[PDB]
Coordinates of C-alpha atoms in Angstrom, one line a residue:
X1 CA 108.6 95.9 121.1
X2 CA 109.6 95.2 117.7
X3 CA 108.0 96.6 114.4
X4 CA 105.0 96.5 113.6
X5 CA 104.2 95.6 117.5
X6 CA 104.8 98.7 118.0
X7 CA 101.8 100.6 116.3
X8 CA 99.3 98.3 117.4
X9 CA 97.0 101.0 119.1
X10 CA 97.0 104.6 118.6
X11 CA 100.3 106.4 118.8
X12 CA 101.3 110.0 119.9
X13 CA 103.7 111.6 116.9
X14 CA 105.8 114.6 116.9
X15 CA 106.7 116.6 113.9
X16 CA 109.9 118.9 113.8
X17 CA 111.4 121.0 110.6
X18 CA 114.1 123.7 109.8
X19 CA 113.6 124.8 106.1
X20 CA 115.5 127.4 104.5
X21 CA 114.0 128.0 101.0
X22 CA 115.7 130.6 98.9
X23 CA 117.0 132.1 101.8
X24 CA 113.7 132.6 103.6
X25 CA 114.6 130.4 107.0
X26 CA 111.4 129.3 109.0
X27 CA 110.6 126.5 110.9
X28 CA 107.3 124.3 111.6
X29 CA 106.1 121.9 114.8
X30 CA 104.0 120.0 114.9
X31 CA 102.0 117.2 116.5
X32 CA 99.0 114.5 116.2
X33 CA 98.3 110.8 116.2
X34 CA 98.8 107.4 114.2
X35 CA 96.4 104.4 114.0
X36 CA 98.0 102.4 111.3
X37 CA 95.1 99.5 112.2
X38 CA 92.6 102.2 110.1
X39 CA 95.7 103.7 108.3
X40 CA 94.6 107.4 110.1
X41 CA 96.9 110.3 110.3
X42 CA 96.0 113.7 112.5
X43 CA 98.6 116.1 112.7
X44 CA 98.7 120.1 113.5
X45 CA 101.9 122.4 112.4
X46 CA 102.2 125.6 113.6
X47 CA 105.1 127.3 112.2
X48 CA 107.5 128.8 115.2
X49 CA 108.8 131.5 113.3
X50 CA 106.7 134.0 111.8
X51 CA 104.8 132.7 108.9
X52 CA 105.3 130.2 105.8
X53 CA 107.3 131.7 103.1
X54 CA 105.7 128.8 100.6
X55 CA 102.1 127.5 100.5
X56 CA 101.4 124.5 103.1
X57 CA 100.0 122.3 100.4
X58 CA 104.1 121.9 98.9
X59 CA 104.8 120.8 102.5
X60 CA 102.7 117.8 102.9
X61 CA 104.0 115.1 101.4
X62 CA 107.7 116.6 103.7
X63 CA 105.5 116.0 106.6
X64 CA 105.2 109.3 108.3
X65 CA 104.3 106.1 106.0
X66 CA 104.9 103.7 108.8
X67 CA 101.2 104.9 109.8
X68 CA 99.3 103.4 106.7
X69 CA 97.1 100.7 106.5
X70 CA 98.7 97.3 105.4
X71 CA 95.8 94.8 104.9
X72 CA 96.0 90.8 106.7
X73 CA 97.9 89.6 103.2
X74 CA 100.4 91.9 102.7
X75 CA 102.1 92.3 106.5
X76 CA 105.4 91.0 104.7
X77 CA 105.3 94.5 102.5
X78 CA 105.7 96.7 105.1
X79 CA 108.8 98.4 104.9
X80 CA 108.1 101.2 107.2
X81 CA 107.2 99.4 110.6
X82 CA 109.8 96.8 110.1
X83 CA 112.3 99.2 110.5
X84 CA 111.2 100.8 114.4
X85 CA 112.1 101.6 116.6
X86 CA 115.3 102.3 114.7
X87 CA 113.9 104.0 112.3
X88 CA 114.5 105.1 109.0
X89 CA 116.1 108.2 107.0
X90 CA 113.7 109.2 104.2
X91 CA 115.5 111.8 101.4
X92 CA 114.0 113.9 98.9
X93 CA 114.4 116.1 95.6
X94 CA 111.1 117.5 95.0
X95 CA 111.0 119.4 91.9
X96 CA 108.2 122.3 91.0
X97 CA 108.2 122.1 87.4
X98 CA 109.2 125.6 85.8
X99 CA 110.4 126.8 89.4
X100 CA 112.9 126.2 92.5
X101 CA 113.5 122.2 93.6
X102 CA 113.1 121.3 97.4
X103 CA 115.7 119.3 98.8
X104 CA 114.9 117.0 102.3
X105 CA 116.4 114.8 104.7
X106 CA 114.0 113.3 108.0
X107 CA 114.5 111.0 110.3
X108 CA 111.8 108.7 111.0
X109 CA 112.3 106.7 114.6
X110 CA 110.5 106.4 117.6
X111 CA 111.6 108.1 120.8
X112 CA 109.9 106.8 124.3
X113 CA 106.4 105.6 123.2
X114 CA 106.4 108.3 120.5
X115 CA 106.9 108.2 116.4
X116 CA 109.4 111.6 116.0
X117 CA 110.0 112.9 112.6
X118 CA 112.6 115.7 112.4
X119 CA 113.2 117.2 108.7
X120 CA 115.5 119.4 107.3
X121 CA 114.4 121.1 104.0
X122 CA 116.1 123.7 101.6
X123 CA 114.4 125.1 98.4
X124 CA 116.3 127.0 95.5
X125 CA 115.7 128.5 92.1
X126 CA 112.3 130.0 93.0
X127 CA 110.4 132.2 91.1
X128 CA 109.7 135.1 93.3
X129 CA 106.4 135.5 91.1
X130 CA 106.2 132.0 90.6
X131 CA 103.0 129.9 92.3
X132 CA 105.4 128.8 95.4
X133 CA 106.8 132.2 96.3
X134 CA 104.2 133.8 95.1
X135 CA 101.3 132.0 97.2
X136 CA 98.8 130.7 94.3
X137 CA 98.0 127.5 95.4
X138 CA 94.4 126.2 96.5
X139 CA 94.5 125.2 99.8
X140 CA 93.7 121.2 99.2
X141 CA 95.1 118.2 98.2
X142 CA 94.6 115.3 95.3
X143 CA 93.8 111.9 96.4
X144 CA 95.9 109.2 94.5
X145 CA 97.9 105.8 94.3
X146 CA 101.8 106.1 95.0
X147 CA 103.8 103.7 93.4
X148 CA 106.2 101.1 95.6
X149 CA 109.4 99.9 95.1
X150 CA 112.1 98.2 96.8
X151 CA 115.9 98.6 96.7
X152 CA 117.8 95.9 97.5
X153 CA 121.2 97.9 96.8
X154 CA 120.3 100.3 99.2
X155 CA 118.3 97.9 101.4
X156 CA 114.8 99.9 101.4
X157 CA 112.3 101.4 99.2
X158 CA 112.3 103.9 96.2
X159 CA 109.3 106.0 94.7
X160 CA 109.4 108.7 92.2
X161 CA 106.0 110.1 92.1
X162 CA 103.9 113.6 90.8
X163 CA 101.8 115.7 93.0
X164 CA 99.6 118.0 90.9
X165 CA 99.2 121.2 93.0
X166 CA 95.6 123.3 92.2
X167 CA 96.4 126.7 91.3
X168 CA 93.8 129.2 91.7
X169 CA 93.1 130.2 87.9
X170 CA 92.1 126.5 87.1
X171 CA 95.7 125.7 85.9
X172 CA 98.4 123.1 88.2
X173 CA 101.7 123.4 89.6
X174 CA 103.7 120.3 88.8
X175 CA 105.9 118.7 91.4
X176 CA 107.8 115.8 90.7
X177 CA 109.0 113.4 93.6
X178 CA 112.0 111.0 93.8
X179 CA 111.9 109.5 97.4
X180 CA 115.0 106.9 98.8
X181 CA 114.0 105.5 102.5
X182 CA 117.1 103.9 104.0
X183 CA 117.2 101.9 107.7
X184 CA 119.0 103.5 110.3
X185 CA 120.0 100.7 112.2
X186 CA 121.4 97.6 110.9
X187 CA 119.0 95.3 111.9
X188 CA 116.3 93.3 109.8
X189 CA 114.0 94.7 107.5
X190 CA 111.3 93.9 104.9
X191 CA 111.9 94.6 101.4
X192 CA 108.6 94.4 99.5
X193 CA 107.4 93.7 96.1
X194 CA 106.2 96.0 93.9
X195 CA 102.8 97.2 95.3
X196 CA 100.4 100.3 96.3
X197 CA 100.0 103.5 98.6
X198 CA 96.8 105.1 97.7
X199 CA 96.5 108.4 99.6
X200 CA 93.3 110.6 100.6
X201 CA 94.3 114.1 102.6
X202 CA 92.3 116.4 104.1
X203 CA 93.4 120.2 104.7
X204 CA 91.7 122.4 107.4
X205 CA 92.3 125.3 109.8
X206 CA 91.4 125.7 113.3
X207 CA 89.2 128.5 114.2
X208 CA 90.8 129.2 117.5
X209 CA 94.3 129.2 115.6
X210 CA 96.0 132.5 115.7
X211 CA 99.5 131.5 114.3
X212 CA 100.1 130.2 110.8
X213 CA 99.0 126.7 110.9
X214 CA 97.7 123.7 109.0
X215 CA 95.3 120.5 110.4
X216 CA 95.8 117.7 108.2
X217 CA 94.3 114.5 107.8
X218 CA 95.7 111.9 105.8
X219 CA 94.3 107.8 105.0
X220 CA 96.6 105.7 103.4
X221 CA 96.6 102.2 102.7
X222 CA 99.0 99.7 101.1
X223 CA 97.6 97.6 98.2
X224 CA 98.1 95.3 94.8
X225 CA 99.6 92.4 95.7
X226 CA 97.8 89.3 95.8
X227 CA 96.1 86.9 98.0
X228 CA 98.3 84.0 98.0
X229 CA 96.5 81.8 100.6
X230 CA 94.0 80.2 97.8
X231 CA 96.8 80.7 95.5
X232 CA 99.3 78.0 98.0
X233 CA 96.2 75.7 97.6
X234 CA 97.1 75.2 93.8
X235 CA 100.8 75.4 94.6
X236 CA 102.3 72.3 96.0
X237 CA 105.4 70.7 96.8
X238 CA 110.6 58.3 91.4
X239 CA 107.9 58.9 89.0
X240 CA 105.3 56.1 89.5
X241 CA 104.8 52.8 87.6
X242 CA 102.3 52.7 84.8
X243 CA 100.7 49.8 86.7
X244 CA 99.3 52.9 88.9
X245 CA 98.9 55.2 86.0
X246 CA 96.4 53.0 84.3
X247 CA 94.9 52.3 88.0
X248 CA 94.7 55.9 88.5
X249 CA 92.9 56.6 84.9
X250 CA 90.5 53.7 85.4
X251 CA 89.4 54.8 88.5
X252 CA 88.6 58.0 86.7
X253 CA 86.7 56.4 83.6
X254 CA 84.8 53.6 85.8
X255 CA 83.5 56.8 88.0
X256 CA 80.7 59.4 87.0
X257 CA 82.3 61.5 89.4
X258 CA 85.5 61.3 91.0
X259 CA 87.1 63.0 94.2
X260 CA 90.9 62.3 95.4
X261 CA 90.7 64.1 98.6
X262 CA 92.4 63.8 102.3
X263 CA 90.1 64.3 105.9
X264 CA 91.8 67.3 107.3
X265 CA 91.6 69.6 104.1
X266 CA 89.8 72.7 104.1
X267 CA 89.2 72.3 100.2
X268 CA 88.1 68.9 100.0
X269 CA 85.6 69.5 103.3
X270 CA 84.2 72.1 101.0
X271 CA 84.1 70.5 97.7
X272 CA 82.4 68.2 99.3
X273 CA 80.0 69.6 101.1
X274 CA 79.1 71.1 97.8
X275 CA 78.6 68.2 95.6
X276 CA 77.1 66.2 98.5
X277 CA 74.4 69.0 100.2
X278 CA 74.4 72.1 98.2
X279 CA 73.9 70.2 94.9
X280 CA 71.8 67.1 96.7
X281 CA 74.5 64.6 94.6
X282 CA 74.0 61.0 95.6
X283 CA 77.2 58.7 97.3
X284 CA 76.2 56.1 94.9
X285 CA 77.6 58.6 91.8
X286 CA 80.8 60.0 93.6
X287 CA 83.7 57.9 94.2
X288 CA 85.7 59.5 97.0
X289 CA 89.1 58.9 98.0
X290 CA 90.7 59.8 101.3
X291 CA 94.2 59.5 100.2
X292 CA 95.7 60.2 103.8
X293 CA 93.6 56.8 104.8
X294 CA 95.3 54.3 101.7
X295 CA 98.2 52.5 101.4
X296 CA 99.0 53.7 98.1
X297 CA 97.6 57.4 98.9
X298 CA 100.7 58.6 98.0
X299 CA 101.2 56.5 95.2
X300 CA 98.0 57.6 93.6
X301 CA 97.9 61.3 94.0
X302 CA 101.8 61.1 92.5
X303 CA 100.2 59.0 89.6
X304 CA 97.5 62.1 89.5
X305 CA 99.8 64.4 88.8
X306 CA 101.9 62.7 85.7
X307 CA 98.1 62.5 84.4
X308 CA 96.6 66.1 85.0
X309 CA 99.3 68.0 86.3
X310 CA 97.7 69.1 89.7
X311 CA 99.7 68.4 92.9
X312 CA 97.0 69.1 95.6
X313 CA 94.0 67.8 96.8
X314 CA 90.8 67.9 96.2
X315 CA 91.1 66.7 92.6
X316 CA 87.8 66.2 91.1
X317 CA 86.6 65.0 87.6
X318 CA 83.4 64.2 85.9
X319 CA 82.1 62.0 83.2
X320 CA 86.3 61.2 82.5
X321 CA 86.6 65.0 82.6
X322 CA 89.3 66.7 84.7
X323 CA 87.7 70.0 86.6
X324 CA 90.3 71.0 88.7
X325 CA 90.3 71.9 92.9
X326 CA 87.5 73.2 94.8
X327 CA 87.9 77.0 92.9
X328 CA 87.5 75.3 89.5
X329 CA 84.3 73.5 91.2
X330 CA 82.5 76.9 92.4
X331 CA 83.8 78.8 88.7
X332 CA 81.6 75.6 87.3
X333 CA 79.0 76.6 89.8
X334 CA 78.5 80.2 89.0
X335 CA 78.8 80.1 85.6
X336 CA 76.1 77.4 85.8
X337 CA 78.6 74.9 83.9
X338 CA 78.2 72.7 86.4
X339 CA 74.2 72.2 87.0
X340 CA 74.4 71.3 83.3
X341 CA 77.2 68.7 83.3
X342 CA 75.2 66.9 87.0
X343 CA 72.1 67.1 85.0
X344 CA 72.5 64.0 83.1
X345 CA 74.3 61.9 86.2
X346 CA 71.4 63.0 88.1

């Protein structure tokens, strides 16, 4: 299958990396499971050589974004899945402020029914007494919202973001992110607009674990851009004699209450519905108009717009006054605008 296809149910992932920081080689495996449906991450490292010569916290964000959460609006957002099973190289300069910078390259692609990332990290300039070499960090992690951006030059996404490390004597260890994620193959991808990542992690040890290790949980789900399905309902794609114009306008003075509308649209069913049941309004005070079923439908609605502005249907107005779509109806209705402006009609 193709992208996002692809993490449909639960998938098996598979975590590899060689690190070398100031000269201290060791190297981590590890392994889990994706559901990007919840946006749930459950991995387990166990380092293959010995033990960690920096704290596992400064390792997380080094060890799979294709896994979060991308809600029913934003599917054209996500970067990630779009570019499997390819894959994608993700690179990083990670820098601990007043220590050593961590350097990364990891190749993000799936092989056989599994998600593989393999990273290769090298750290220099550390403090041997600093909170890295030195082992001061709390073993947990912040929860926060990451920052999205595309780049077009480079055909994927940038993010330069801060983790805030906990250090044991109430204090933080700074460490600055700048991520570039690039396609692998040349196939199509989705660039996004500017948008969300919020994280949650979780950080926890396994009793029967004998090696150095680390089990971490992770939710992550994309966010900030907007709904734009009852946004397109406002959106819509020879200007028409005055002859209608006036038509138009009369209509709209000679009616209490007026409704352009057409028989197969969502909005007008519902305007209606709500001037006609929920409010109890009588026919005999609303002037409907299925413009789909007129000769001059067309005609009319154009003549609608050069006199209010609004291209869609339902357009409704009261009392000569111009209210809007169906949204504009039910703002009226909440804030109780409405009730007053029926109470005299009715």
């Amino acid at each position: 299958s193709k992208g996002e296809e692809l993490f449909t149910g639960v998938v098996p992932i598979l975590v590899e990396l060689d690190g070398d920081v100031n000269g201290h080689k060791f190297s981590v495996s590890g392994e889990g499971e994706g559901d990007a449906t919840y946006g749930k991450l459950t991995l387990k490292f166990i380092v293959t050589t010995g033990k960690l010569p920096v704290p596992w916290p400064t390792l997380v964000t080094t060890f799979l974004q294709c896994f979060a959460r991308y809600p029913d609006h934003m599917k054209r957002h996500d970067f990630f899945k779009s570019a499997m099973p390819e894959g994608y190289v993700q690179e990083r300069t990670i820098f601990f402020k007043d220590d050593g910078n961590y350097k990364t390259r990891a190749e993000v692609k799936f092989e056989g029914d599994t998600l593989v990332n393999r990273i290769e990290l090298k750290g220099i300039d550390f403090k041997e007494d600093g909170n890295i070499l030195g082992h001061k960090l709390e073993y947990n992690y912040n929860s926060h919202c990451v920052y999205i951006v595309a780049d077009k030059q480079k055909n994927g996404i940038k993010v330069n973001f801060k983790i805030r490390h906990n250090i044991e004597d109430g204090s933080v260890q700074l460490a600055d992110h700048y991520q570039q994620n690039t396609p692998i193959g040349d196939g199509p991808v989705l660039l996004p607009d500017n948008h969300y990542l919020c994280y949650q992690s979780a950080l926890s040890k396994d009793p029967n674990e004998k090696r150095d290790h680390m089990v971490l949980l992770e939710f992550v789900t994309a966010a900030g851009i907007t709904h734009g399905m009852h946004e397109l309902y406002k959106s819509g794609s020879g200007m028409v004699s005055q002859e209608t114009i006036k038509h138009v306008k009369d209509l709209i003075a000679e009616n209490e209450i007026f409704v352009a509308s057409k028989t197969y649209c969502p909005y007008s069913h519902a305007a209606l519905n709500t001037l006609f049941e929920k409010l109890k309004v009588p026919r005999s005070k609303v002037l409907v108009l299925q413009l789909n079923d007129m000769k001059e439908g067309a005609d009319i609605q154009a003549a609608l717009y050069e006199i209010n502005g609004q291209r869609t249907v339902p357009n409704i107005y009261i009392n000569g006054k111009h209210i809007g779509g169906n949204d504009d109806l039910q703002e009226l209705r909440e804030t109780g605008e409405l009730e007053e402006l029926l109470e005299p009609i009715l």
